[PDB]
Amino acid sequence: AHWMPGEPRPAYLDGSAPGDFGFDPLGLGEVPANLERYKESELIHCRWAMLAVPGILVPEALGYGNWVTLPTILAIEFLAIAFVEHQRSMEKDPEKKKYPGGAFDPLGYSKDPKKLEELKVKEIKNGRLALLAFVGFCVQQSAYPGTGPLENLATHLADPWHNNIGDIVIPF
Amino acid sequence: KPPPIGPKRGSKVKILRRESYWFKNVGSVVAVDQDPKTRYPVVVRFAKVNYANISTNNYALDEVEEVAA
Amino acid sequence: SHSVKIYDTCIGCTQCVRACPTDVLEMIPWDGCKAKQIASAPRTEDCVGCKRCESACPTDFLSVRVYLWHETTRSMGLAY
Amino acid sequence: TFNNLPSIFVPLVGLVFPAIAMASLFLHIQKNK
Amino acid sequence: ALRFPRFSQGLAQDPTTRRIWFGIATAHDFESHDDITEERLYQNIFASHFGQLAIIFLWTSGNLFHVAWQGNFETWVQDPLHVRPIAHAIWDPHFGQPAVEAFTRGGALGPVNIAYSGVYQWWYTIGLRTNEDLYTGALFLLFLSALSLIGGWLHLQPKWKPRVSWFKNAESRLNHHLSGLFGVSSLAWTGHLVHVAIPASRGEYVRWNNFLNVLPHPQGLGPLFTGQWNLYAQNPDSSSHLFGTSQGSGTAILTLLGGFHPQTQSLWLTDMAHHHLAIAILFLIAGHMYRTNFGIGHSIKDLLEAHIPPGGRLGRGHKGLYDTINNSIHFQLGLALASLGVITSLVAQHMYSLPAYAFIAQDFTTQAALYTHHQYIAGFIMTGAFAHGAIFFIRDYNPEQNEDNVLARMLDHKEAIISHLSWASLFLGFHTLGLYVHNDVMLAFGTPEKQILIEPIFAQWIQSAHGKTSYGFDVLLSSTSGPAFNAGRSIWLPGWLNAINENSNSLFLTIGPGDFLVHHAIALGLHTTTLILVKGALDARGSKLMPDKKDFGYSFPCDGPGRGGTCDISAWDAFYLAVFWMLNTIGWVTFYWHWKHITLWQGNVSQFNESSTYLMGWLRDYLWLNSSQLINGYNPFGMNSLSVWAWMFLFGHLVWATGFMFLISWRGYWQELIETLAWAHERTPLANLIRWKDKPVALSIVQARLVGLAHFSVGYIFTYAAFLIASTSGKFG
Amino acid sequence: MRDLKTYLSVAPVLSTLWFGSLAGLLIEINRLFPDALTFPFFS
Amino acid sequence: ELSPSIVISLSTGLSLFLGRFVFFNFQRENVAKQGLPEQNGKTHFEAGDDRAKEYVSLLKSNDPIGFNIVDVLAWGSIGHIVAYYILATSSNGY
Amino acid sequence: DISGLTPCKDSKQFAKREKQQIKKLESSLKLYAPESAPALALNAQIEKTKRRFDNYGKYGLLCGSDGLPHLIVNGDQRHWGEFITPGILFLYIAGWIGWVGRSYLIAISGEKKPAMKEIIIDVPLASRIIFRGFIWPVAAYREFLNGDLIAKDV
Ligand code: CLA
Ligand code: CLA
Ligand code: CLA
Ligand code: CLA
Ligand SMILES: CC1=C(/C=C/C(C)=C/C=C/C(C)=C/C=C/C=C(C)/C=C/C=C(C)/C=C/C2=C(C)CCCC2(C)C)C(C)(C)CCC1
Ligand SMILES: CC1=C(/C=C/C(C)=C/C=C/C(C)=C\C=C\C=C(C)\C=C\C=C(C)\C=C\C2=C(C)CCCC2(C)C)C(C)(C)CCC1
Ligand code: SF4
Ligand code: SF4
């Protein structure tokens, strides 16, 4: 229950929150309002990245599209998404801003509170992992311009002790 | 009261007066005028002089605050 | 002419007025200090503004204080 | 006449307008009501 | 108030002669005038602004009228590269016949003065190809001056008298000024450039009698309403255009081809048209921001009370700042002069590099006079911005109404700011003077290979980041594979590259170690002027030596010899010494400019690149060398056209030395001297009949300071104007 | 003498001693290592 | 050709739909929160400026949400803007 | 070869500066006998100049079109001998000066009249401190972490 066991946990996050490991070394979540907004935005970023990563490796495993016109698809995108995002902005209850439930929770996963807390922990963990995975996709596409993520995993599994990150991180 | 009203003789004190040279600087109370009608009884003696080459000045009780040391 | 003011931080040392070369100041009785006297400035019309008074005020910043203001022939110190 | 207009206006301006201006302004200085 | 100062009965009740000076000098300090209000303050300011606009239009009308009447503009239009501009004729009856013979230039039948203001180029670039055009413009500007005068008269009358609640309407005013005064104004300027200036460049003259008939583009407004705006950029004057005739012209009115016109070495009129149009869209959109009588928009008060960062770094944020700015005219004036000085320096830095007027790059005295002008103007405007911020911190700053806010938290760490600006100036002056002196010595020891020459790698990187291949960094525009080069590959970069790489023009000059060192001298000057001004502004309310300085005002002489001495303690005196350092800084800027440019124009850039790295090069190869044709303006055997510039040079030297009198000598020696003089006059027979009315006195300390600075700055300015104009006119490279 | 050393430790006497020693140091360095613009060791 | 009369009406109707239906409550919320442009703690009209007088007559709309003529100008200014942006950026082959 | 500057080991104008200074010093050398003190000193200055130019050549200095070494400060590893290594060499000494001075002022701060120790410099105290600035980059770092570098307002 700590990102680095030994560091003093700050006073404003201590384990009660769903995904609390005491990782605020810069002191961004000092005040409570910014902290609440941050966990909202964290859950949203997490859910978008977890929507993204299976939309990357699945096209790459079969389609090999490499995840790479404007004035119509852009307009339909903005129209479809701004509506949902502002309707999300129109909620004021914070625990319902993070976890609305109701018309968003079918299958009755939110029926038991203890499993709800455990599943919130699961969501936030898998989501931080997926945010890291997307940042990995982006920087691996920046370093290697024309390679896929699963392609890079094959590159690693071929000779892992010779094809790794080191080639880019140091000049030699 | 006939007993002392202000800091002790020798109590290193801080100045909260914004117009003094030794503002937010420590001092050394050398005397406190026990007359309960003077406005600035606290005679302080600082270490470094002001621009007028003076190391002492009278201060009030509310324009002064003793340090934890 | 000039506006001389004496604030309540005065210790009544009588240097402000013993330095003042134009009889602007005068010590009066008071109950705010151990010396039981404070300086007053009745004859501000005779005030030239030389600030010898406040070059001799031994306080935190000052108790006597000269404010430069409407300059007349006697505040400008003219024999003509 | 256009070549003769500076000869009328420069002695007019740079000498009379100082006469008029400095005189009237000295009178405005030395006034009492 | 009984005597001449009707606005201060403290100076009217002054039998001396200080009242005349202080009634001149405080005439325009309305918020210090006696027995006035805020209504009368704002209304006098409004009428004063009307008078300023009247004077501005009158002065422009005088320029136009004298160029039309006494000028050679119709001759300048034909052969501009080889016909000299003419500001105005001269009728000085002190002239001798050699001087009448020497000052006859530009094909005139009498003496004349050469327009080193560039008004010829800018009028010729915007149409105006006859003297009658300039006459109509001058008459219309005279009408506009009379319009401003009657407006400022009637807005003082009680019927038309705006209340303070109208002046403080900082949202309607902002919306209107943005939208109209910038957006519609630049839009109207485009509507001139498209209808007049470009057709006047493309040939045909489009005037008031025929501007409704002439289509600015062969397909009028179909392309605009139908969205096909690309039809306005079809024939963009394809590189063979002669400014003022249809040869090699086109039909476009709005382009983004960038770069320079090849004939004029100036910017394209179509680029200026599209530019003013685009920024018109931006300003007309931005002027619909602030809340007004129509229910929508922003309240700047809540914009400021909302920009308070959680975390308490800024503390109370911008809370209470709308009320402390809108009520404080000095804060508005300080911010205004800040922005104005920065954009004035921008005008200079972009008119020298990106000249927007025909045949102003190839003429060389106007391009220097304008830069020097606007940069000294910017330095003065900046000193005034800070001085008015100081006057705000004294007069108009309420510490309780803005407690712990960005402004209050600012005054807290004034010692930190002052100390770190002191550090920056001290570091820069120490090091860069040390390097200039090291190089002076290394030349004085015949070892120029030992000099500290730091190549300005960062400015050269920015240059190579814009298309200059003179260094070989090949980054973001000199690299063909860079996406920034690929984006604007088809829009502007051909013209911009054949402009910036062309080593004849003056944008993005090839810089070297002397440029590094003088840029650091410039940084020293800016940081130091800033230090002086910021320190005066933040210690304006008080310090440890004089904590009740707000009670004495902004301008007061001193606080006496007590407390060690308090000469030049007021924020006014900070402004004072900052004007000195500002003149010094702008002198460095303009010396750098003029030497780099005169060496470029002459052709020997090596002169600057070798001699600018050691100060004796500036004293020899810039001042001593370029002052050769000036001081010989009138020798014991004859004179030439540069006689006036030599006389002005020495005149400026004279007043610049006279200022040292009022600065070095102070008040007391002169009062005693005047006492002796008064004795002598009152006891001298036949002059005892004459007795003064104002008792004579030596000048007050703050006054004589101001007078010394006036003489000092007048001499600085007139001397350098004489030198710059004469050096660039004695040769024109 | 104690007072002679007290005077030798005064700010100007000690300053000129310190700067004479320092100046001799830099002088002998610029004679033994003259004409130096770049630090070539591990360059 | 993008039919310059169809894209412009389309984008304008789009901006009006995004105004009234999607976020007018957000815009009116921010209007009521930012409030009038007060000076010294009071509105300009409440300070003596007779010329401010926020025009309730122009704002008195009986559209059941309150979409006044000024909001129609607002959403439609943005509409014509985005329309001509699309049209111009689509005109040239860049 | 960066910033459009040729190295001085392969520059023409740099060698021209060399030849010109050598001819200048030789023109002042044909006025004395080749064994006297002036001619010997001139020959020593000549060898000094020649070795100077050759050392500026061999260090990889960059000589521009004017033929003088233009120092590179950007941080290029080849040109750390221009600014960064002597910059560290400076800052080490400068912080030595500051740190021994600061520890001296703190040492005399607990004196009855400290100012007399700023006039009459306590040479034993300073000399015991004069080498304590050798370790300033670590002592100052700890005083910053412990809170002893920066004072507290009270
Ligand atoms: C004895 C020396 C002397 C004098 C008196 C003059 C006089 C004159 N010269 Mg100059 N000149 C001289 C030497 C002199 N010259 C020399 C040696 C040269 C070099 C060869 C020249 C070169 C020269 C040129 C090239 C020109 C002149 C011009 C002029 C005329 C300017 C018109 C005017 O009325 O200005 C009025 C005064 C001013 C504009 C000065 C403004 C600043 C004042 C001091 C501030 C005013 C204060 C306040 C705001 C107003 C209150 C009222 C005030 C009256 C008190 C004027 C007749 C010009 C000319 O002929 O045009 C008509 C012109 O173009 N002269
Ligand atoms: C759209 C309506 C509108 C317009 C056009 C104006 C116009 C103006 N107002 Mg405003 N005003 C308005 C509405 C408007 N007002 C409203 C509703 C209020 C209600 C409170 C006010 C209250 C108000 C006050 C209180 C004051 C003004 C003032 C002014 C004048 C400013 C001074 C000036 O001319 O510089 C104009 C400057 C520019 C157009 C451009 C400056 C900066 C550019 C970006 C520089 C770069 C380009 C440069 C110009 C190129 C030059 C090249 C070459 C041609 C030389 C100007 C005439 C002042 C004035 O003079 O009083 C009459 C003044 O004191 N106004
Ligand atoms: C050449 C003239 C000159 C010079 C050198 C300076 C220098 C300075 N002025 Mg300016 N100043 C000047 C003219 C000058 N001023 C004038 C005419 C005025 C109008 C009154 C002002 C008004 C003014 C104000 C109002 C302010 C300054 C400030 C400063 C300091 C800026 C920090 C800096 O760059 O210092 C770097 C150091 C130097 C430039 C000193 C050069 C000398 C060398 C380095 C000393 C070493 C040589 C040698 C070994 C010593 C022994 C000599 C001998 C005994 C043997 C600096 C001391 C500002 C300040 O204090 O900021 C910190 C400030 O607020 N000055
Ligand atoms: C601030 C600006 C400035 C700068 C940067 C320089 C820089 C330089 N000048 Mg110039 N100079 C300047 C101002 C400046 N000068 C001024 C104002 C003058 C007029 C007084 C001169 C006059 C001048 C002359 C006449 C000469 C120079 C020379 C030099 C060079 C000196 C190299 C040298 O001998 O150091 C070598 C290093 C030292 C002397 C310091 C040694 C420090 C000791 C040994 C302690 C370090 C060791 C320590 C124990 C730590 C080791 C690590 C470990 C134990 C921890 C250098 C390029 C000389 C040169 O060769 O020009 C190129 C030369 O001939 N200069
Ligand atoms: C005293 C005072 C005052 C006055 C002051 C002043 C006068 C100031 C000034 C100031 C200034 C004068 C400032 C300036 C600034 C600047 C800046 C801050 C800049 C920025 C920039 C940027 C950010 C950029 C960007 C970019 C680039 C780089 C280029 C290209 C484009 C882009 C955009 C990208 C007042 C009244 C206020 C108040 C009181 C106090
Ligand atoms: C790399 C480099 C560069 C750059 C750099 C930079 C940009 C830096 C920055 C830096 C910074 C931004 C810094 C800051 C700081 C701050 C602070 C705040 C500090 C403090 C300190 C202290 C406090 C100390 C003290 C001391 C010492 C330790 C010494 C002596 C003594 C004393 C006590 C003085 C370049 C490229 C140009 C060149 C090359 C090199
Ligand atoms: S000098 Fe000052 S303290 Fe002394 S008597 Fe006068 S006012 Fe009082
Ligand atoms: S300023 Fe001079 S005259 Fe006035 S009270 Fe002080 S000492 Fe007396």
CSV table of N, CA and C in Angstrom, one decimal, chain E residues 38 161-171 223-230 285 291-303 322-323 326-327 486-491, chain G residues 1 4 8 27-28 30-42 44 47-56 58-59 68 70-71 74 81 84-85 87-88 91-94:
chain,number,residue,atom,x,y,z
E,38,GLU,N,-12.7,63.5,-9.1
E,38,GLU,CA,-12.4,62.5,-10.0
E,38,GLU,C,-13.1,62.7,-11.4
E,161,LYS,N,-20.8,65.8,-20.6
E,161,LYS,CA,-19.7,65.6,-19.6
E,161,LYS,C,-19.8,64.2,-19.1
E,162,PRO,N,-19.0,63.3,-19.6
E,162,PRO,CA,-19.1,61.9,-19.1
E,162,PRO,C,-18.8,61.8,-17.7
E,163,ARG,N,-19.5,60.9,-17.0
E,163,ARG,CA,-19.2,60.7,-15.6
E,163,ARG,C,-18.1,59.6,-15.4
E,164,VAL,N,-17.6,59.5,-14.1
E,164,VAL,CA,-16.5,58.6,-13.9
E,164,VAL,C,-17.0,57.2,-14.1
E,165,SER,N,-18.3,56.9,-13.9
E,165,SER,CA,-18.8,55.6,-14.2
E,165,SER,C,-18.7,55.2,-15.7
E,166,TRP,N,-18.6,56.2,-16.5
E,166,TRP,CA,-18.4,56.0,-18.0
E,166,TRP,C,-17.0,55.7,-18.3
E,167,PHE,N,-16.1,56.5,-17.7
E,167,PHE,CA,-14.6,56.3,-18.0
E,167,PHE,C,-14.2,54.9,-17.4
E,168,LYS,N,-14.7,54.5,-16.3
E,168,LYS,CA,-14.4,53.3,-15.7
E,168,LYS,C,-15.1,52.1,-16.4
E,169,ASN,N,-15.8,52.3,-17.4
E,169,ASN,CA,-16.5,51.2,-18.1
E,169,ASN,C,-15.4,50.4,-18.9
E,170,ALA,N,-14.6,49.6,-18.2
E,170,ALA,CA,-13.4,49.0,-18.8
E,170,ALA,C,-13.7,47.7,-19.6
E,171,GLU,N,-15.0,47.4,-19.8
E,171,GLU,CA,-15.4,46.3,-20.7
E,171,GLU,C,-16.0,46.8,-22.0
E,223,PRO,N,-15.5,35.7,-55.0
E,223,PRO,CA,-14.6,34.9,-54.3
E,223,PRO,C,-14.7,35.0,-52.8
E,224,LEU,N,-15.1,36.1,-52.2
E,224,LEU,CA,-15.2,36.3,-50.8
E,224,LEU,C,-16.4,35.7,-50.2
E,225,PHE,N,-17.6,36.0,-50.8
E,225,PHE,CA,-18.8,35.4,-50.3
E,225,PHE,C,-18.9,33.9,-50.6
E,226,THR,N,-18.4,33.5,-51.7
E,226,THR,CA,-18.4,32.1,-52.1
E,226,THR,C,-17.3,31.3,-51.4
E,227,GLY,N,-16.5,31.9,-50.6
E,227,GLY,CA,-15.5,31.2,-49.9
E,227,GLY,C,-14.2,30.9,-50.7
E,228,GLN,N,-14.2,31.1,-52.0
E,228,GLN,CA,-13.1,30.8,-52.8
E,228,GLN,C,-12.0,31.9,-52.7
E,229,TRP,N,-11.5,32.1,-51.5
E,229,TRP,CA,-10.6,33.2,-51.2
E,229,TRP,C,-9.3,33.0,-52.0
E,230,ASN,N,-8.9,31.8,-52.4
E,230,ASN,CA,-7.7,31.6,-53.2
E,230,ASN,C,-7.7,32.3,-54.5
E,285,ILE,N,-12.9,39.7,-33.5
E,285,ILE,CA,-13.3,38.6,-32.7
E,285,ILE,C,-13.0,38.9,-31.3
E,291,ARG,N,-18.0,41.7,-21.2
E,291,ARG,CA,-19.4,41.8,-21.0
E,291,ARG,C,-19.9,43.2,-21.1
E,292,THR,N,-21.0,43.4,-21.8
E,292,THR,CA,-21.5,44.7,-22.1
E,292,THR,C,-23.0,44.7,-21.9
E,293,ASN,N,-23.8,45.6,-22.5
E,293,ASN,CA,-25.2,45.8,-22.2
E,293,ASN,C,-26.1,44.7,-22.9
E,294,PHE,N,-25.5,43.6,-23.5
E,294,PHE,CA,-26.2,42.7,-24.3
E,294,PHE,C,-26.3,41.3,-23.6
E,295,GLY,N,-25.9,41.1,-22.4
E,295,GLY,CA,-26.1,40.0,-21.6
E,295,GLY,C,-25.0,38.9,-21.7
E,296,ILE,N,-24.2,38.9,-22.7
E,296,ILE,CA,-23.1,37.9,-22.9
E,296,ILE,C,-21.8,38.7,-22.7
E,297,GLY,N,-20.7,37.9,-22.5
E,297,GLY,CA,-19.4,38.4,-22.3
E,297,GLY,C,-18.8,38.1,-20.9
E,298,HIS,N,-17.6,38.6,-20.8
E,298,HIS,CA,-16.8,38.4,-19.6
E,298,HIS,C,-16.8,39.6,-18.7
E,299,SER,N,-16.8,39.4,-17.4
E,299,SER,CA,-16.5,40.5,-16.4
E,299,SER,C,-15.0,40.3,-16.0
E,300,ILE,N,-14.2,41.3,-16.3
E,300,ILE,CA,-12.8,41.2,-16.0
E,300,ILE,C,-12.6,41.1,-14.5
E,301,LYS,N,-13.5,41.6,-13.7
E,301,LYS,CA,-13.4,41.4,-12.2
E,301,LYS,C,-13.4,40.0,-11.9
E,302,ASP,N,-14.4,39.2,-12.4
E,302,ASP,CA,-14.4,37.8,-12.1
E,302,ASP,C,-13.4,37.0,-12.8
E,303,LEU,N,-12.9,37.5,-14.0
E,303,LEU,CA,-11.7,36.8,-14.6
E,303,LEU,C,-10.5,36.9,-13.7
E,322,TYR,N,-9.0,44.5,-10.4
E,322,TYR,CA,-9.8,45.3,-11.3
E,322,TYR,C,-10.1,46.7,-10.6
E,323,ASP,N,-10.4,46.7,-9.3
E,323,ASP,CA,-10.7,47.9,-8.7
E,323,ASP,C,-9.5,48.8,-8.4
E,326,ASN,N,-8.7,50.0,-12.4
E,326,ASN,CA,-9.8,50.9,-13.0
E,326,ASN,C,-9.9,52.2,-12.3
E,327,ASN,N,-9.7,52.2,-10.9
E,327,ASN,CA,-9.7,53.4,-10.2
E,327,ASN,C,-8.4,54.2,-10.4
E,486,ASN,N,8.4,21.7,-44.2
E,486,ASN,CA,7.4,21.0,-45.1
E,486,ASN,C,6.0,21.6,-45.0
E,487,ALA,N,5.7,22.2,-43.9
E,487,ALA,CA,4.3,22.8,-43.7
E,487,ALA,C,4.2,24.0,-44.6
E,488,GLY,N,5.0,25.0,-44.3
E,488,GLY,CA,5.0,26.2,-45.1
E,488,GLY,C,5.9,26.2,-46.3
E,489,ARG,N,6.1,24.9,-46.9
E,489,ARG,CA,6.9,24.8,-48.0
E,489,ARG,C,6.4,25.4,-49.3
E,490,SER,N,5.0,25.6,-49.3
E,490,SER,CA,4.3,26.1,-50.5
E,490,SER,C,3.6,27.4,-50.3
E,491,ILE,N,3.9,28.1,-49.2
E,491,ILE,CA,3.1,29.3,-48.8
E,491,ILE,C,4.0,30.5,-48.9
G,1,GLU,N,-15.7,22.1,-55.3
G,1,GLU,CA,-16.6,23.0,-54.7
G,1,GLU,C,-17.4,22.3,-53.6
G,4,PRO,N,-20.8,26.6,-51.3
G,4,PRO,CA,-20.6,27.5,-50.2
G,4,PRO,C,-21.9,28.0,-49.5
G,8,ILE,N,-22.3,26.7,-45.1
G,8,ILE,CA,-22.4,27.8,-44.2
G,8,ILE,C,-23.7,27.7,-43.4
G,27,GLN,N,-23.3,28.1,-20.6
G,27,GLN,CA,-23.0,29.5,-20.9
G,27,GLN,C,-23.8,30.4,-20.0
G,28,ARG,N,-25.1,30.1,-19.7
G,28,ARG,CA,-25.8,31.0,-18.8
G,28,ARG,C,-25.3,30.9,-17.4
G,30,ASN,N,-22.1,30.4,-16.6
G,30,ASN,CA,-21.0,31.2,-16.5
G,30,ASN,C,-21.3,32.7,-16.6
G,31,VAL,N,-22.4,33.1,-17.3
G,31,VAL,CA,-22.8,34.5,-17.3
G,31,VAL,C,-23.2,34.9,-16.0
G,32,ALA,N,-24.1,34.1,-15.3
G,32,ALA,CA,-24.6,34.5,-14.0
G,32,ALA,C,-23.5,34.4,-12.9
G,33,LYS,N,-22.5,33.6,-13.1
G,33,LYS,CA,-21.4,33.5,-12.1
G,33,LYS,C,-20.4,34.7,-12.3
G,34,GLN,N,-20.0,35.0,-13.5
G,34,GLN,CA,-19.2,36.1,-13.8
G,34,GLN,C,-19.9,37.4,-13.5
G,35,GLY,N,-21.2,37.4,-13.6
G,35,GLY,CA,-22.0,38.5,-13.3
G,35,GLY,C,-21.8,39.8,-14.1
G,36,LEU,N,-22.4,40.8,-13.8
G,36,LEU,CA,-22.3,42.1,-14.5
G,36,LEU,C,-20.8,42.6,-14.3
G,37,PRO,N,-20.4,43.5,-15.2
G,37,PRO,CA,-19.0,44.1,-15.0
G,37,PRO,C,-19.0,45.2,-13.9
G,38,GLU,N,-18.9,44.8,-12.7
G,38,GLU,CA,-19.0,45.7,-11.6
G,38,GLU,C,-17.8,46.5,-11.4
G,39,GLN,N,-18.0,47.8,-11.0
G,39,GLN,CA,-16.9,48.7,-10.6
G,39,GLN,C,-17.1,49.2,-9.2
G,40,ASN,N,-16.1,49.0,-8.4
G,40,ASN,CA,-16.1,49.4,-7.0
G,40,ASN,C,-17.3,48.8,-6.3
G,41,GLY,N,-17.6,47.6,-6.6
G,41,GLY,CA,-18.6,46.8,-6.0
G,41,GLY,C,-20.0,47.0,-6.5
G,42,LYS,N,-20.2,47.7,-7.6
G,42,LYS,CA,-21.5,47.9,-8.2
G,42,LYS,C,-21.4,48.0,-9.7
G,44,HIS,N,-22.1,49.2,-13.6
G,44,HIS,CA,-21.9,50.5,-14.2
G,44,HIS,C,-23.2,51.4,-14.2
G,47,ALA,N,-23.7,52.7,-11.0
G,47,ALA,CA,-22.7,53.7,-10.6
G,47,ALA,C,-22.9,55.1,-11.2
G,48,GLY,N,-24.0,55.3,-12.0
G,48,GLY,CA,-24.3,56.5,-12.6
G,48,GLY,C,-24.2,56.5,-14.1
G,49,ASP,N,-23.6,55.5,-14.8
G,49,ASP,CA,-23.5,55.5,-16.2
G,49,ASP,C,-24.9,55.2,-16.8
G,50,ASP,N,-25.5,56.2,-17.3
G,50,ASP,CA,-26.9,56.0,-17.9
G,50,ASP,C,-26.8,55.2,-19.2
G,51,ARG,N,-25.7,55.1,-19.8
G,51,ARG,CA,-25.6,54.5,-21.1
G,51,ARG,C,-25.4,53.0,-21.1
G,52,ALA,N,-25.2,52.4,-19.9
G,52,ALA,CA,-25.0,50.9,-19.9
G,52,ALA,C,-26.4,50.2,-20.0
G,53,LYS,N,-27.1,50.2,-18.9
G,53,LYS,CA,-28.5,49.8,-18.9
G,53,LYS,C,-28.8,48.5,-19.7
G,54,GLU,N,-28.3,47.4,-19.2
G,54,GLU,CA,-28.3,46.1,-19.9
G,54,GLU,C,-29.7,45.9,-20.5
G,55,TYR,N,-29.8,45.7,-21.8
G,55,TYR,CA,-31.1,45.8,-22.5
G,55,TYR,C,-32.0,44.6,-22.2
G,56,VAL,N,-32.9,44.7,-21.3
G,56,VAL,CA,-33.8,43.6,-21.0
G,56,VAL,C,-34.8,43.4,-22.1
G,58,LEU,N,-34.2,43.6,-25.4
G,58,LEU,CA,-33.6,42.8,-26.4
G,58,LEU,C,-33.4,41.4,-25.9
G,59,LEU,N,-33.4,41.2,-24.6
G,59,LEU,CA,-33.1,39.9,-24.0
G,59,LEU,C,-34.4,39.2,-23.6
G,68,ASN,N,-32.1,34.2,-26.4
G,68,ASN,CA,-32.4,35.5,-26.8
G,68,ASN,C,-31.7,35.8,-28.2
G,70,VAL,N,-29.4,37.8,-28.8
G,70,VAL,CA,-28.0,38.0,-28.7
G,70,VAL,C,-27.3,36.6,-28.7
G,71,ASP,N,-27.9,35.6,-28.1
G,71,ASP,CA,-27.3,34.3,-28.2
G,71,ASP,C,-27.4,33.7,-29.6
G,74,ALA,N,-24.6,35.2,-31.3
G,74,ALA,CA,-23.4,34.5,-30.8
G,74,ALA,C,-23.2,33.2,-31.6
G,81,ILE,N,-18.2,31.8,-38.9
G,81,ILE,CA,-16.7,31.7,-38.8
G,81,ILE,C,-16.2,30.3,-39.2
G,84,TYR,N,-16.6,29.6,-42.9
G,84,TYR,CA,-15.6,30.2,-43.9
G,84,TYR,C,-14.2,29.7,-43.6
G,85,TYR,N,-14.0,29.2,-42.4
G,85,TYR,CA,-12.7,28.6,-42.1
G,85,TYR,C,-12.6,27.3,-43.0
G,87,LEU,N,-14.4,26.6,-45.6
G,87,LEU,CA,-14.4,26.9,-47.1
G,87,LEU,C,-13.0,27.4,-47.6
G,88,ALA,N,-12.4,28.3,-46.8
G,88,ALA,CA,-11.1,28.8,-47.3
G,88,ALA,C,-10.0,27.8,-47.2
G,91,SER,N,-10.5,25.6,-50.1
G,91,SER,CA,-10.4,26.2,-51.4
G,91,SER,C,-9.1,25.9,-52.1
G,92,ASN,N,-8.0,26.3,-51.4
G,92,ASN,CA,-6.6,26.0,-51.9
G,92,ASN,C,-6.3,24.5,-51.7
G,93,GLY,N,-5.5,23.9,-52.6
G,93,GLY,CA,-5.1,22.6,-52.5
G,93,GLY,C,-3.9,22.4,-51.6
G,94,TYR,N,-4.0,22.8,-50.3
G,94,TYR,CA,-3.0,22.7,-49.4
G,94,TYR,C,-3.4,22.0,-48.1
